[PDB]
Design a protein around this ligand. Sequence first.
Ligand SMILES: O=C[C@H](O)[C@@H](O)[C@H](O)[C@H](O)CO
Lengths: 466, 464
Amino acid sequence: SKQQIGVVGMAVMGRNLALNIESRGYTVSIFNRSREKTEEVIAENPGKKLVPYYTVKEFVESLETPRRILLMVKAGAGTDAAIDSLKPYLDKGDIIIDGGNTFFQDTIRRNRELSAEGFNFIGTGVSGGEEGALKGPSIMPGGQKEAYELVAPILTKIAAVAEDGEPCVTYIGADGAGHYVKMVHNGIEYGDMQLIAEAYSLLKGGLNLTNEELAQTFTEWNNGELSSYLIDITKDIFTKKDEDGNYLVDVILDEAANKGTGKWTSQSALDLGEPLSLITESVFARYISSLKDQRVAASKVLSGPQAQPAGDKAEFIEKVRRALYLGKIVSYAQGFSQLRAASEEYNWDLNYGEIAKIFRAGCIIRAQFLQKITDACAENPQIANLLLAPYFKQIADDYQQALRDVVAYAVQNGIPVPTFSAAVAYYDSYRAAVLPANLIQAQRDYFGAHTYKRIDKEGVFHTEWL
Amino acid sequence: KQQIGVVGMAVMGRNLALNIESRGYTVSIFNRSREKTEEVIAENPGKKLVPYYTVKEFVESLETPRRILLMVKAGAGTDAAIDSLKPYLDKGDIIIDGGNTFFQDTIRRNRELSAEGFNFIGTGVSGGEEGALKGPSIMPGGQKEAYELVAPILTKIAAVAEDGEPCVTYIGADGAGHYVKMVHNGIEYGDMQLIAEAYSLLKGGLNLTNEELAQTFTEWNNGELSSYLIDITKDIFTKKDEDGNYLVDVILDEAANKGTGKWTSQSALDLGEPLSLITESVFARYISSLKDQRVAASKVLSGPQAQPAGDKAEFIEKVRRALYLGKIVSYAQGFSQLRAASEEYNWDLNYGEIAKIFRAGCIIRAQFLQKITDACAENPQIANLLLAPYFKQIADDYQQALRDVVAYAVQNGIPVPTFSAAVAYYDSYRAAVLPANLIQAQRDYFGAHTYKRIDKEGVFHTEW
Ligand SMILES: O=C[C@H](O)[C@@H](O)[C@H](O)[C@H](O)CO
């Protein structure tokens, strides 16, 4: 007997994807380079149609042809090694799906090489954390359309489904487009978590709310326009205690770790000429959190102010709420503008409304907010920036004063607000018909004879400033 | 024979050649295009410049160990020029690439050439076309022995600081010099953006005329802010268009850079360094380049107008203080990046010596660099310039002005990305506890990533 699909990589996401597939009625072969993990999965899941393999040769031979193999291995060297191991055992026409968090340029190279060798390849993002991998993640596949059609049925079976019944999987585009979209999802996730962290800093620093009051505040916010998976889990985190009675949030070390897709999104913004300030400041905020020993030392020598009077409690809470929602809007406007720049550079003809649609459920950034983006893109598929869409434009009209008030309060109080700060600076630069870049261009001409253009005549000019 | 030859007669190369000749040396010059070489000779009669029209004759014209300064445009024309030189070189010869080359390419070339018995010095040269001619800041990395062999020539063509010291020094091995040149360029983008925000605040908040802006920048240039960029800025505000109007007001506000301004920030991202100010400066150029989008958005989006500025002299002083403290933060971030790069690429950089060669010749030259040199002399392995006594004092005295300026700008609709980043960085770096505890809790909740605790050792995971 042979199984229908095989999964390589039994760390949590891959094991949970295998169990997700088996839960839809499929029989699944599994393999992992560290064999003891495969034994663990079998011991922990008696009764499920998972069949373990302990060599790659036997794993491949166990699959119905054309084979469908999903790889969920560590990005980079590990993924290339897994593919190189499978190759000698495959038949032309076999289907390889790389669902790891792979850098998109690696997928463009791999798609080229494997398609030339006659394999059907799909590089796909998978988002949803441990629970979404098990129950239904967002799935963003790229590659040749013929390859996607060979796996669309199974990907649809395992993907999350939106409340309107639409599966959270769709063909993203050619070659590396799917892994590029997964990277941008992770960059947006970094930005949403830093925005929430700044709201927490503001409520705790400005109002001295207790953890119970922070949980109540996030619960109320989750009942309105801010409802999202990240705010829903935050409200839970603030009441969790350990075996001794300590709130976990207060004993967890404030050193935010990362696995790269945050840095990759920002490095891509820098390559594409996109001003992706909010997600990039979120990466830098994780980086400075990781300099804990330096911060502890500096906290003992550098001076600063104390928090200023916050005024009426409910009014302050509502301003922070409005600052957080408008901050999100600015972060996503920057992220979707980057998706357009990447689509143009890499020739993907991305469908932005469809990307937002698959993020309505499954993924970590899931929220009703994604329907607001889906609808703005449906109305204007090539909209240049979400801030121009009526819904977003009007929220900015209504909420920008709260955001400005919150940033001024935080700065006077010494509470760091890198992303709320960045959101104001971006909104005020994007709407500015004239910026002080005229001076920067005059300086470059002065010290380096770089030439500049004029607003009243054609051509390039160079001046003797003295 | 000549002690040194220059390859590439575009403007930078020809100027370097004239600088060297100006010091008393005879210089062999060569160029891929016979024309430019011919053009150069004509323009400077009497200057000892010996032209060669073949790479072979060019190389044989040089005293061993040969010193060949390569000033072709950083790109693929560099590997082409080296490819053409190799067959005529002898073991021990030295190729010196003065292009604005990406440091990883210099690391590759230095490794490849060494294996073939040739030395390779990748060097930054800062100062502009004019600086190259009169005295640039020179930042060379590669084999130290090769550097010491050509150092007599470099020390005579470099700019000189107040204390008489030439603005050149051995930076470190392989690509260390081109890495430092890159960071100098990142710091230059940060200084220009900080000045641009000060201009925005003075013009939008106080409605200063160009004459008043020039007067203000002149006064600032007399004190601690003294710098080449502030000196040229007051000249720009004084420059009138041939019709009595100011030229800066008709320049298109689309800031270029040419695909290289992003390198410092990309390296910060690779090294784990929070280089927010310089990076926001690159993003400010990127958004200025999206002019069609900005004009479209300006017809749709709403915002506040400038708020009452209050006393004029007080407002100007607060902006001055904000500018100086913002520069301190930008350099603190940049020197911390130099330490992380030194560790990653194994260079054992001397930070005080790097600050010393930036005192003159380069675009960021300013009195300020001496304060950094002083701090590094006292403490060569200082983790961050904010910890040095002089800088901690300025931050204690000027932070309130910076905070007042950012709050004013935000209420007024005036974008201040780098002043904003400076406050956020200062308030994050001094914070013993940040809200990253919630981020770690979230990562453990949704992806079981585990977390550390402040009261126990080890990695923990919670069934949330
Ligand atoms: O937050 C950063 C995590 O290190 C990173 O791994 C991703 O966010 C991942 O998608 C979580 O599953």
